[PDB]
Amino acid sequence: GLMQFTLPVRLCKEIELFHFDIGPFENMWPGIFVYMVHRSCGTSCFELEKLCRFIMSVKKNYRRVPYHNWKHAVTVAHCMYAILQNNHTLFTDLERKGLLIACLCHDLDHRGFSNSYLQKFDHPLAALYSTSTMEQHHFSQTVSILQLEGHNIFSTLSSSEYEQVLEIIRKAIIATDLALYFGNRKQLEEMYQTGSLNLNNQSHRDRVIGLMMTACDLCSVTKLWPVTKLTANDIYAEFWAEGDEMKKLGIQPIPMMDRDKKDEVPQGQLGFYNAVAIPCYTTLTQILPPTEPLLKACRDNLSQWEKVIRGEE
Template sequence: MLQCLALYIGALCHDLDHRGKNNKFMLDTESPLAAIYSTSTMEHHHFNQTVTILQQAIAMTASDLSASSKPWDIQVETVKVIFEEFYQQGDAERAAGRIPIPMMDRNQPDQQPSSQVGFLTGICVPCYTLLDSLIP
């Protein structure tokens, strides 16, 4: 299934935003794209256009949220790491004289459960529901 999805995305993105000219023409005419991509001008352009679209696409968000779709024991360990990162930011904010938001305040660990429930129900479930409707 993963290979099929990769091939599908590759097929969609092949020659994305093709300008009707080859790499040599782009270099010889000093096109703006050739100034950005000095080798394999159009291939680099197609790839970067693809990345730009994927960053807007729901699939990038779903990948970012993927820990929430893992088995519970793995998800629990991931959440510990994420909250430690949040707490370190909260510590840095407190050291800078700021008040961290409750989720990033290690002095308020009771905020973790409601934060996770809100994250799962408000962000993860809608994201994966949409992704499932787009790519069943």
């Protein structure tokens, strides 16, 4: 109760910034997460014994794939942490509690394959869940771990607070399905621009928490160039493995997933920044102005990909 988590000085300072990288020491990632819960939520939010047991079960249910792994989960939670700390007064006690947990859990038991590959393979999960296939699975795995003995970090909540927090987490995790992001941002664009965006409207909050989830999920484009660039290698290593698997089913994959079309990576990054990342962080900065550093860092990395194309690296 009188037990703080503290971090070495460089981490204690750098963890508050959007562009923080959690480092290559896996054994420090739980401590980093707990540190972030304590400052974002309070040391009273979760029974420490229960939190540590929940963190370790979550970790154990991430797989050793190149990108969609335990480091991705803690990275996406840290970005949520930065957004929540730079927008103190906008969010409920429940929202702060649910959103860091949603982010840690958002890709539970990911196999490194898209919803599309599950559907073309005819994976059982695509019969159980016809849309947002992996995301409904991730929420399912979250509920499972929460129901393990000694793992109910929410046990102290009222029946109905418990229900509101699992419903925040469910919507938050579903929203990481990028197919859903495009319409969600178009609506947020229109509501902000016509002046109708209202944060007391629960369906408006939902959309806004949705956009933050896309922003956190994509935060590798908001890091220092060497982090961003090395993460792109992990991202493509899954996509190309997925393309291999498409070819094994007798299907030409899209070029994004075709390791034979590596040479066109720089132009694909451009499309992605222009079609996905920039619009995401633009609309996010409009709604939540202290998130501007994410937009500024994304634009800097877009300009680094422009340099790659011009053969200036």
